[PDB]
Each structure stands twice: as C-alpha cells, then as structure tokens.
Amino acid sequence: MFEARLVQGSILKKVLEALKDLINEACWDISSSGVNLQSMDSSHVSLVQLTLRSEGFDTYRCDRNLAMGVNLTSMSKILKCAGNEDIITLRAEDNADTLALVFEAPNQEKVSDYEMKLMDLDVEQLGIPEQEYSCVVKMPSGEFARICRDLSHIGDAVVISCAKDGVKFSASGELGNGNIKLSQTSAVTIEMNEPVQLTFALRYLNFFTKATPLSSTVTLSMSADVPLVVEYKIADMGHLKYYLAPKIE
C-alpha cells in the first residue's frame, strides 16, 4: 500500500497549480524515498522535475514502487476542493487503478474523500545530467516573475547576461527593446565561475513562474550549450526544477 499524510496540504495545491498548465499528464513515481515526477512538456522544449521526499510528510508508507499515470487537470480539480489549511492524505493500493485523496479541515468537522482514475502511461524516462554551472543566480521569486512578464510585452526571447556584480535581462521586438539590470545585493546573489550570455523563450518562463507561491526565492543555473534550470525550493521537503533548452533561431 501507499499512504502519505501532508498536514500542510497547501504545498500540493500549489504544486498542481505550478504544473497543470504546462503538462497534461505525467507519472508520479512513488517509492520509499518519496514522490518524484519527471516529464517533458508536449513540445519537448522543457522538462519539469518535482521532488517530495518522504521525510516531508507527516506520515509516509510505500510498500512497493509505483508509477501512477495521472491527468493533471483532473488532479487539479480535485485539489481545488481542498481548503488552504487542510491536511491532505494520498493513498493507493499496490498496482493501483485509482488514487484516493482525503481532505481533513482542521478547524471544521468536514472530511472530503475523492477518488481519481489513473491512466496507463508508456514510460520513457531518460536521466538528467549531473553538473555544475558557470553562473548561479539567486534572487527573489516575485522579481523574476515580474521581469519575465514585463519583458514578454516587448519580445519573445530573453537574453540573460550575467557577470560577477550583476545580472541583466534583455528583450527586443517590433515596438523596441528593453533591459533590466539587477545589482548583486547585501537579496540578489551571484556565484559565477565565468560570465554567460544566453537566450531563452519567455513563453516557457512565464509558465515556470506559476511556481512562485512555493518559495520567496528562485535560483537560475546556467552554462553555455546546456538548459537553464529554474529551481523553486519546497521548504524542508523538496523542490520543483524546470529545465529550458536554449533558444535556437
């Protein structure tokens, strides 16, 4: 059997909000380590990677590994029926055909039980390379969301340009061009082995930023000839990483 109890049920609601508009269905890999999801979007230009370690759940049991094929829109509709302060329990039989989600209102005397149908999904899961990066930029998540939103009003593509003392974001379209320069602060932090000047699709980025409610900070890891990683920490329990292939033209 699988059973996971998360008192801060709101984490789950935000994760579904952060995922459901980018990918339609995905395998939730459940094991003794916790809950892992890894999925490319339809176009294969981006990849999402969710970790929820077992020790972040108030209780966790996984008797056998399990790949749960999930329609993310359906899971999201179910999770909208949870209040923000609900304790959320996930539960599935071995070789499950369905997933049970139970929501306990901690003030109120109200219990909701939902039962989600699972999909049979053909796997195909390739390893994500382990590496270190030329530049790692830590900054406030709300700032990054705003910067991506604003620039998308000017152009399709963001040039991200990073040196030891600051990071620059540039866009350019029909109406003109723009660039936002943030200075490293005493927070905006830059850990740089060497400078980078890389271009990416804002359309995808403005989807990553729907994870903003998970954390007040976001980190950007980049190198020449490799995907951008935009990571959001899910405090004391995991993270949500989005990878973005460089833009070609």
């Binding site: 490319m40 294969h44 230009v45 981006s46 390739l126 390893g127 390379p129 490799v226 995907p227 292939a245």
Partner: peptide, 9 residues
C-alpha cells in the same frame, strides 16, 4: 538542439 532530448542521458 532546442529540444531537451538533445541533452538527456
């Protein structure tokens, strides 16, 4: 090259 497949392992 503008696909993630390119980079997977």
């Amino acid at each position: 090259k503008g696909l993630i497949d390119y980079y997977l392992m």
